[PDB]
Amino acid sequence: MQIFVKTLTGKTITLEVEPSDTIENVKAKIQDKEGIPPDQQRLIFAGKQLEDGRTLSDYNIQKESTLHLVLR
Amino acid sequence: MQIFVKTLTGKTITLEVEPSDTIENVKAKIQDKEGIPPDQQRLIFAGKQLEDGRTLSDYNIQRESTLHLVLRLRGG
Amino acid sequence: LSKPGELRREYEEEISKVAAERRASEEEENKASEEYIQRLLAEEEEEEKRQAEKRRRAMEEQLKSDEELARKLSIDINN
Lengths: 72, 76, 79
Ligand SMILES: OC[C@H]1O[C@@H](O)[C@H](O)[C@H]1O
Ligand SMILES: [Mg+2]
Ligand SMILES: [Mg+2]
Prior knowledge:
The complex is a heterotrimer. Chain A is α+β, with helices and mostly antiparallel strands. Chain A has one domain. In chain A, 17% of the residues lie in helices and 32% in strands. In chain A, strand 3 and strand 4 form a beta hairpin. Chain B is of the alpha+beta class. Chain B has a 5-stranded mixed sheet with strand order 2-1-5-3-4, covered by helices on one side. Helix content of chain B is 16%, strand content 32%. Chain B is globular. In chain C, 92% of the residues lie in helices and 0% in strands. Chains B and C meet through loops of B and helix 1 of C. Bound molecules: beta-D-xylofuranose and magnesium ion (2 copies). The PDB classes it as transferase/ribosomal protein. The entry lists the keywords ubiquitin, TRANSFERASE-RIBOSOMAL PROTEIN complex. It forms a trimeric assembly. The organism of A is Mus musculus. The organism of B is Mus musculus.
């Protein structure tokens, strides 16, 4: 399952995830591509900021959904 | 043997088959002809969905029988 | 009576409509996120301006207080 993460600079990165992944997993995957430590990452989907312990399926995030990255 | 396949929008195609052909075989023939992936196809005959591992003879499909085709439509 | 690709072309048209609905659904999602971010950054910009303004007034009042002490001092050390 592929999703997109958009940064404030406007670039889009692609992530390979599963519905079971937590938001904390996703921040780790963003770390691996961008080098941004997870504790500086805020993730937003559908106008709401996502919580570390919850899962992608908890937020109805599905393939080709777009998450938005805003740094602390 | 010729059989007919029909969709819910009224369209009918003709397929050349043998009674020993499996339903998986039939769905592959429909793919080669109409470009519809077998996993997007559902076939119906005599009030039941036809399973991939069974043959046309298993469902008593004969010359000029008409199957119904239901498409699974997928953006996802 | 399906001509070469007639069922094929209905399938492609119907897939296209499913894709267009996903894009429409995603647009509502992405506009909520983009308006959320706009608000969040505006609220963090206003907060930092309030903090910097608080710092400015504290420094300005320290200056006045320092002058008050300095005058009491200069009058004491020169007469
Ligand atoms: O939580 C998001 C929901 O809002 C719409 O995009 C869809 O109905 C759901 O995915
Ligand atoms: Mg890592
Ligand atoms: Mg083939």
